[PDB]
Amino acid sequence: GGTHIDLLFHPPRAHLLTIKETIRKMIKEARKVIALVMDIFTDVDIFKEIVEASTRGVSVYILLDESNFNHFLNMTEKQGCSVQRLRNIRVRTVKGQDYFHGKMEQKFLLVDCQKVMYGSYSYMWSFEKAHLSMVQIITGQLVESFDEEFRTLYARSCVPSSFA
Amino acid sequence: GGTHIDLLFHPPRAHLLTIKETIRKMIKEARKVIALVMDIFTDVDIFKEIVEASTRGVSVYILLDESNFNHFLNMTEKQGCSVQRLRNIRVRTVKGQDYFHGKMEQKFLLVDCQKVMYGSYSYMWSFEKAHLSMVQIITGQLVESFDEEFRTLYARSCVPSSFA
Ligand SMILES: COC(=O)[C@@H]1C[C@@H](O)CN1C(=O)c1ccco1
Ligand SMILES: COC(=O)[C@@H]1C[C@@H](O)CN1C(=O)c1ccco1
């Protein structure tokens, strides 16, 4: 087996779902595991879908850029929905080399070791309404390289300071 | 023919060249055309390579995020190297929908309609020294989709205001 890749764009071009609707669909259809690497995560709709998935029993692992993590924490506080009290979600932070903050500038979503969304869309209102972006939907062989990269990032991640 | 994809990382993992050395190599080996879509372009080494390519006769088309274009202009002024006086380089800007600036958040390099570098590396010192990032080197069938996306972006681009 090879690798299959479909492109999606924001705004949409020659496909039926927006990128955001495709993210929510990927998450709603997850059976086993969600592995997410994201620079900035403030989009409440996407967060809700991930929380719902975790309540069905899906194991969710989230790696967030350290410098922007406060924005995720602010969003989860506003929502009354602490990741520390959700048993099936683990969140850790990843940073680069400071000099000015070094950042984890990689974004992808990996579901059931089966499908990846890889591209320039960040989970924020601005990507739904303001920015131009594109992603690949990847299935097949190359997915295993994303699994390996998620594990690689996970190994260099830290428990966030906030958490006890 | 299908599509072939190799991953590269910053910092490097199981490959010989850094992403930046691979960018310079792609550019130095271009025979015909370079098509670049970039959010922020301040890296002087990469810029030098693109100028050299244009002086060999390579047609270079650069699409830059509008909101960050001043940073490119500042870099080319510091370098004494105006894109308006280089006959084989065209530069245009692309913007999103403002509300706060909407941005073109897509980055890729497309050389000779043959090879693409697609991923999270921006052409700035910070990506060489501080940030974690990854790209794909793509060849084969999927390259034609990047060609089509470059043309799509180009059609929605503007002459930058500075230029006369
Ligand atoms: C599917 O929803 C949309 O495409 C909306 C509809 C119109 O408001 C344009 N738009 C944008 O999101 C956008 C982002 C960058 C440039 O435009
Ligand atoms: C090939 O050059 C490098 O990898 C340098 C060497 C060491 O200084 C680490 N590094 C980084 O660029 C970096 C970016 C994010 C985290 O580390």
From Swiss-Prot, chains A, B:
PTM (free text): Phosphorylated in vitro by CSNK1A1.
Localization in the cell: Cytoplasm; Membrane
Superkingdom in the source lineage: Eukaryota
Outcome (variant: K107A): Loss of interaction with EGFR. Loss of activation of EGFR
Main function: Probable proto-oncogene that functions in the epidermal growth factor receptor/EGFR signaling pathway. Activates both the EGFR itself and downstream RAS/MAPK and PI3K/AKT/TOR signaling cascades.
Comment block on domains: All members of the FAM83 family of proteins share a conserved N-terminal DUF1669 (domain of unknown function 1669) domain of about 300 amino acids. This domain mediates the interaction with casein kinase 1 (CK1) isoforms. Therefore, it has been proposed to rename DUF1669 the polypeptide anchor of CK1 domain.
Subunit text: Interacts with EGFR; positively regulates EGFR inducing its autophosphorylation in absence of stimulation by EGF. Interacts with RAF1; displaces 14-3-3 proteins from RAF1 and activates RAF1 within the RAS/MAPK signaling cascade. Interacts with AKT1, PIK3CA and PIK3R1; activates the PI3K/AKT signaling cascade. Directly interacts (via DUF1669) with casein kinase isoforms CSNK1A1, CSNK1A1L, CSNK1D and CSNK1E.
Family: Belongs to the FAM83 family.
Protein name (record): Protein FAM83B
Portion of the full-length sequence here: 117 to 287 of 1011
